[PDB]
Symmetry: C5
Subunit: 336 residues, 5 copies
Amino acid sequence: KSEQLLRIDDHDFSMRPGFGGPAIPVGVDVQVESLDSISEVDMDFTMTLYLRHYWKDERLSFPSTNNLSMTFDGRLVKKIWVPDMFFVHSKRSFIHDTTTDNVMLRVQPDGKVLYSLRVTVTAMCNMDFSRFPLDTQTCSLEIESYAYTEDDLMLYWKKGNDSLKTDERISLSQFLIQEFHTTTKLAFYSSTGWYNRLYINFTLRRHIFFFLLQTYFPATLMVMLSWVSFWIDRRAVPARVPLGITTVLTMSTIITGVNASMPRVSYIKAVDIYLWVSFVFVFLSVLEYAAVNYLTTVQERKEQKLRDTHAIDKYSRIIFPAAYILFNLIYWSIFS
Amino acid sequence: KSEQLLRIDDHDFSMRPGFGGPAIPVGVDVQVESLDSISEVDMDFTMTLYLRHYWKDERLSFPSTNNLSMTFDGRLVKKIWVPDMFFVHSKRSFIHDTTTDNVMLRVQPDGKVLYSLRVTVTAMCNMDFSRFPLDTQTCSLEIESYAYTEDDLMLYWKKGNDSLKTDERISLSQFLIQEFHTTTKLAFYSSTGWYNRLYINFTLRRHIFFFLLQTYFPATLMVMLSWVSFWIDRRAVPARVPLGITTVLTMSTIITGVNASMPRVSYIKAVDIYLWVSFVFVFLSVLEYAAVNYLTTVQERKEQKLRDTHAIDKYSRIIFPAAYILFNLIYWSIFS
Amino acid sequence: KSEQLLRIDDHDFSMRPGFGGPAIPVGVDVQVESLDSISEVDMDFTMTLYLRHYWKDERLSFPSTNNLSMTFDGRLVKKIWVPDMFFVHSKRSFIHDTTTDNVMLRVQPDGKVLYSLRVTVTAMCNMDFSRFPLDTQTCSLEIESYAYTEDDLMLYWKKGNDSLKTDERISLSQFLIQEFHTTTKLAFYSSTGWYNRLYINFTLRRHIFFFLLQTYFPATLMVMLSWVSFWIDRRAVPARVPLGITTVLTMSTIITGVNASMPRVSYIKAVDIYLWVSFVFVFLSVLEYAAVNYLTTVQERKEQKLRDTHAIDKYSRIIFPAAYILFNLIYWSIFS
Amino acid sequence: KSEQLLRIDDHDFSMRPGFGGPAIPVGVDVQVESLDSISEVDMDFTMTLYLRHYWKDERLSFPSTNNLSMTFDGRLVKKIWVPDMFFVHSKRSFIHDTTTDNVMLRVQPDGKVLYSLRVTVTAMCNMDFSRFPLDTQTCSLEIESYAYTEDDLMLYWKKGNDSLKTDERISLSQFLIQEFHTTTKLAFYSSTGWYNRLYINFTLRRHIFFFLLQTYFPATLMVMLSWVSFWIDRRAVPARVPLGITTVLTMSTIITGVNASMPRVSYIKAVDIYLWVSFVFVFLSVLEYAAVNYLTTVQERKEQKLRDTHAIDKYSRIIFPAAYILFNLIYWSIFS
Amino acid sequence: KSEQLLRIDDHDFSMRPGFGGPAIPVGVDVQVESLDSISEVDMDFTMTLYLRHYWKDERLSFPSTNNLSMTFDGRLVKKIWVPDMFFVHSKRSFIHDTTTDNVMLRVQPDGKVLYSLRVTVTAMCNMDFSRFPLDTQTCSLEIESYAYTEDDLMLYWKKGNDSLKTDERISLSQFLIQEFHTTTKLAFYSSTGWYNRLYINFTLRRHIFFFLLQTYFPATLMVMLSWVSFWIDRRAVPARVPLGITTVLTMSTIITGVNASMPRVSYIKAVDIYLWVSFVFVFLSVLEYAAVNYLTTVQERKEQKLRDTHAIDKYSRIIFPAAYILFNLIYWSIFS
Ligand SMILES: C[C@]12CC[C@@H](O)C[C@@H]1CC[C@@H]1[C@@H]2CC[C@]2(C)[C@@H](C(=O)CO)CC[C@@H]12
Ligand SMILES: C[C@]12CC[C@@H](O)C[C@@H]1CC[C@@H]1[C@@H]2CC[C@]2(C)[C@@H](C(=O)CO)CC[C@@H]12
Ligand SMILES: C[C@]12CC[C@@H](O)C[C@@H]1CC[C@@H]1[C@@H]2CC[C@]2(C)[C@@H](C(=O)CO)CC[C@@H]12
Ligand SMILES: C[C@]12CC[C@@H](O)C[C@@H]1CC[C@@H]1[C@@H]2CC[C@]2(C)[C@@H](C(=O)CO)CC[C@@H]12
Ligand SMILES: C[C@]12CC[C@@H](O)C[C@@H]1CC[C@@H]1[C@@H]2CC[C@]2(C)[C@@H](C(=O)CO)CC[C@@H]12
Ligand SMILES: *[C@@H]1O[C@H](CO)[C@@H](O)[C@H](O)[C@H]1NC(C)=O
Ligand SMILES: *[C@@H]1O[C@H](CO)[C@@H](O)[C@H](O)[C@H]1NC(C)=O
Ligand SMILES: *[C@@H]1O[C@H](CO)[C@@H](O)[C@H](O)[C@H]1NC(C)=O
Ligand SMILES: *[C@@H]1O[C@H](CO)[C@@H](O)[C@H](O)[C@H]1NC(C)=O
Ligand SMILES: *[C@@H]1O[C@H](CO)[C@@H](O)[C@H](O)[C@H]1NC(C)=O
Ligand SMILES: CCCCCCCCCCCC
Ligand SMILES: CCCCCCCCCCCC
Ligand SMILES: CCCCCCCCCCCC
Ligand SMILES: CCCCCCCCCCCC
Ligand SMILES: CCCCCCCCCCCC
Ligand SMILES: CCCCCC
Ligand SMILES: CCCCCC
Ligand SMILES: CCCCCC
Ligand SMILES: CCCCCC
Ligand SMILES: CCCCCC
Ligand SMILES: CCCCCC
Ligand SMILES: CCCCCC
């Protein structure tokens, strides 16, 4: 029996290696296999990965006439001491078990141990949609020991920045992913002490042209369409009135349609500002012709009682586009 | 073996410490890590947190030549007595188990015990949407012993109001969160007796300006647009009629669009009252011109058989806006 | 050890108390804590509650110099005999286990036992939507023994109608809840025999005014708006035609919008009948003016070849509203 | 102890009764309690039922001075041999366990055994939507032994067609259910051999009138409305043009609305054919008036340069309805 | 006892057969039972299948006076050595367990073993929607050993391309499935070594005619409808203006409706290009008439101050359709 080569029954494996002295170093490597989903309303993401640990234990040494190592599956884990890592700020997670538990242990003649397992985790990521669709988000995944302070266990990246590998075809449907890297930082708990924490960081971006074409293009076209009425004969009331009112109706349908297709986040975003400013421009263009028609009617009635282009149209033909151009300059200087 | 330092086999751990005498005090601390989601239709919320217990047991004392404590994981829990806390008014919950059970026990030489675990819970929160979108909601989470009355176990906050800590970046997507605090109260069960209950309270609010801009602004603009027809020449029937009917159509589309984007709660809310009053104003403006056209036609026919601005327009130009202003004053004095 | 006070090893606990003789009575009490959700398309509901059992077993008696009782948690359940209750017509259910199993046992010196546990259950409830939104539904939850017939186990409510308690703040978002009460009935299985079954009954109702304002009000307003054209000068074709066709378009949008917000139940309901009758009225009002215009044109052409209000408008002004009023009387006498 | 009346330790229960000789017959009965849901996009259904087995084993015989039988729960199952049935073509399933496992065993003095359990299963059902909404679907549930060929185990319906019972109130929200019955058939696996398979069959149908009123009625009404323009004076251009274009807009909104309410199945169905043919009719009616207006204008210009009803309207008034009637005859002769 | 015919206690089953020498070959067969679902936003699919292994172990040989084999269920698996296969790039999976674990073992007198189990798996499949709805996708499922390198275990398809069988009625609701086949490839891990990997490949396609009729047909019809105004008398302003503006409104509603029914993928696809080009054509047709009306008005005013078909219409009648035809030629030569 291979488990008799390790004196299992001859040691207390409820205490750590080196108990009573300096802390035992434990080195970590990570391989990311995929990014599974993201939730914008609930603000979290899901990832699948391999986690590997390295440490030394002299109680595990066995004699050999060679330099061959022995390999075990997850049934040995409950018989020896292993590190207790957990994921900070996570909502749910599990270890894969088909067709059997996805756990491996390899033990060297001198007591060096490698511990490997496959896991899926869902973690939180606070997001800010104030600059949507031009926003940028940063997320992280964090790794920590549950019960051992830095005085008993010293956790570190085994090879620095070479300790993280990512799959060549990692991708998300609605985001672009860039800039993977690792960091470390000490954290403090008033109940027990100081602990080491490791981080995995990355950044997300959207596709800007899709949103430009889908939202900003039609609004601008409808605003430009509402200026056509300034060049139409003011005596054609049955053609001036329906045009303005239908233009309002079209802009309202566009805004409702856009609202139905964005994530349900209930506070004010940049695209909303653009859309409602354009709606106000369309409203003002109807008020203009109302004024013109009233004034013309008054003039005609006065002339008959006593017995060309109106100035408002001439000024509006210049003033409306200039003000829209100035709004656009300010908006795009502010939101980049 | 460390479990032989505690005389495990030498005591009955199916009875409480101090059995037969006064109740044993048990002190509680809570650290909230995050707020995961909220459901407005089902009226509940989800939270993730650390729960810590403190008590003393003389049967656990062990000799030491030092003041060092021993630490265990969750396999020891089934061998000793521990408190049986549960969450009142909850729908589902679980304890995290990756990469192993997230449970810790620390035992002092004199028998003081600390018990720590990590848990996620979903709890109910009755809500009232009568003043939507200006409503305010209050929620709570409650903690109680399942089987021990106040005569056997005394449950209390360890440090009063300093016993609750919350994460610095706790947030929800559609709500603002404020005013965390703790309370206690005795409850009575006719089947067994009196029990101590602990509470965690907080308050939620919405973003008012988003809703103002999205709902109240367009309705008011359309009501103001329907008043334009009072200044148009009454002889232009083909321009007066289509304008009113298209204005009705636009207001109906706006109302349907707003209805599709609120949570599906089927009783009457404030915003509904605002919207349907505005719809009635738009309807009345079409009835006005119907009356005017009929009366003008009668007058002309009478004059021809025998062989300026109509008064109704002049009065309507004043009466409609005053009545809308009075409605707005009353509405906003009532709903703040 | 407290489990040695009960002679556990000295009795066969795979047989019932009183085996071989009359049936053992078992009394039941229920406390409802909350109503969690309801599903109209799948026709089921979810509930969370406490279930308590009472019976006597002389094999459990122990000596005492006092009248104190002993309390156990769920680890004792597998060592003694307990009743096997299950929920009839249910789809899924589970027993809460945080922070430990929510099970209690209390044993009196003379062998009286109390058994308590906390459970969540989803059960079916056949529904009829023919009179929507004026429908009423009745639901029930049923409790039965799986393996013991009335000859071996007699199941009954411990205190009659006082055996059911409900929480003071029980509520559902879209329903009103009323009239909780209990009943009993015998059921028969051809495979094994007769069994006792217990019932918990309640009733659900909707908020009628919300639905009135959201659906019936706009339809009636549009039908009334289509009658305006009967008072308009028949020589204004460019004002009579667009009005009818836009009125049809508005009514169609209203009907689509209403259809998108009701539960997806694919058979005919009362509100559908109301809406499609109103649509038919709006269609008929356009056919009327088509007839009037054709006849006027014929008359003018005839008069010119040879070389006031038309009767159809005068009759329509009376006939349309009377017929709508009669439809409303019949409809509301039929559907209450 | 009742388990000592059966010589449990005295037989190898890892082999079947009658090992080494002819196959052992096993008889099956089924009671369906409910139909829980159906998924049209994923093409599956869910059902809840009781499954009962009957067979004889002489190793289970025990002496009795009477004809009373002994009853056990599911803890005995792991100590004796039982049949290994499984559900073919299923996606997921489980056995109910509240408040304990829903399993029963009854053993007669002579070794006759009854085995009963309660189970929920989700199974696939390939569907064809080509004739929607006039389609008919057939589904089945299949039962088979996992490891024993017909040479070792003979599986059959205990009582033929009397072996299946269904609940009196079984129903689905959007379907009608009819024609339950059972069948049997042999299947062949090249890896191991021939096996017996049992079937449960039933049929589903929709409510036709709901779909008629919701879809076919409005389309036909709009097609009939577009024919009104053939009777309108050809000199009223501002009344002929808006009518056709608004009629197109109404038909497009109707089609979009209908599309949003059917199950998302992306291939061509009958109702789509009806709707797009009607759209083409509405398009052609606008092309007609375009032609008429152009020709009239040419004639007038020619007459002035040189210095009644147009035939196209007269022919269209007959030709359009006849062609629609012929389309309807062919369509309804093809799709029933 | 049948487990005493195999000397279970007489061998260490924690090491592989042939330990210390050449690798042991293991042969694999697969039978696909169904394709359960596909997720376009999350980019994955689900499948249910039978997995079978073949290998030889001399420690399992037993004497027989015949050539009969012994069969076991899944309780034997934990007592002997078996291969540890797992699914690469998968998100979740499980082994069916109703009414018992769906596992079988068959052992020949000479030590040949067959191992069979039933499993459901969800795997990732990166997709590209740039050519939607004319796109083609390829997916695969991959099988690998977790802990043994090619030096210890040699994994291969038992019968080459005859090793894969698929069900005759396998289907998906919105896709067509074709071209199943198998491949093999070596993979390299820097932590442990080289491993053998097996692949199952297939291809998916859509139904093109459904999408043609639903999207491309209405857009083209509306573009053709906007050309009607070039043949209408330029003096009929109240008929030329409403027609263009309503045509814009109809096209906008069509585009919103189409957007609401495609999978929510936020980057630019071919159908979007088609739709927005058609929208631009409709916009240009309104700008044309604006120009024509302005120029006519100028001419009339000049003539009066001093005291037929306009050229722009004549050129537009030719130029618009030619340019649309050229766009269509280029588009369909590019996207096939
Ligand atoms: C072309 C369009 C969208 C389509 C019409 O509404 C016109 C605007 C004009 C301003 C443009 C904008 C696209 C996004 C631009 C290029 C901005 C960016 O650098 C984005 O990061 C700055 C100015 C923006
Ligand atoms: C500006 C707007 C919304 C946009 C148009 O409809 C005009 C109203 C006028 C009344 C305003 C309201 C915004 C919300 C106000 C300020 C109310 C509040 O204190 C909210 O708590 C009281 C009066 C309300
Ligand atoms: C006011 C309104 C709805 C709003 C407009 O459509 C007008 C109808 C008129 C008939 C009313 C109905 C509301 C519901 C009533 C009162 C019915 C009920 O007792 C309901 O149980 C009987 C008559 C119904
Ligand atoms: C009344 C209506 C629907 C409502 C308008 O579109 C007119 C058609 C006319 C043809 C009818 C159809 C209803 C369904 C019928 C009766 C068909 C069936 O036997 C159905 O199985 C054959 C002819 C069909
Ligand atoms: C008939 C229709 C759609 C309906 C109207 O928009 C007109 C176009 C004309 C061009 C056609 C297209 C259908 C798809 C075709 C046949 C393309 C394909 O081979 C598809 O793989 C090449 C040319 C395309
Ligand atoms: C790892 O590399 C990243 C690359 O951006 C850098 O930011 C970071 O500081 C590096 N960390 C260490 C420990 O070298
Ligand atoms: C805790 O502090 C809160 C702060 O609002 C207060 O309301 C509450 O009464 C305090 N409770 C105790 C026990 O001090
Ligand atoms: C319980 O009370 C309800 C109240 O409605 C009554 O209908 C029922 O008959 C009562 N049952 C018994 C057993 O008293
Ligand atoms: C069972 O009855 C059904 C009723 O339709 C019949 O089709 C079937 O053949 C019958 N089967 C047997 C085995 O009698
Ligand atoms: C299996 O058959 C497929 C059929 O396309 C072929 O592509 C593949 O190369 C074949 N593989 C082997 C190993 O024969
Ligand atoms: C309709 C005309 C829109 C013009 C927009 C100009 C935007 C300029 C942005 C300059 C950023 C530096
Ligand atoms: C269209 C004019 C709306 C005017 C609204 C006035 C609201 C005043 C609220 C005063 C609250 C004290
Ligand atoms: C538009 C007028 C609607 C009138 C509806 C009258 C309904 C009367 C119901 C009487 C029930 C007894
Ligand atoms: C608008 C007129 C529709 C007429 C439809 C007639 C359908 C006849 C079906 C005959 C089936 C035998
Ligand atoms: C409205 C006219 C559309 C004409 C489209 C022609 C497409 C030709 C494609 C040729 C591919 C080789
Ligand atoms: C392809 C980018 C288009 C942007 C139109 C505003
Ligand atoms: C837009 C304001 C114009 C004023 C011209 C007098
Ligand atoms: C709005 C009512 C006006 C009445 C004027 C006589
Ligand atoms: C508040 C009830 C309103 C009903 C309108 C029909
Ligand atoms: C609505 C029918 C009126 C007929 C008058 C002659
Ligand atoms: C619809 C075609 C009519 C042709 C009459 C000459
Ligand atoms: C479309 C441009 C036409 C120009 C004719 C002069």
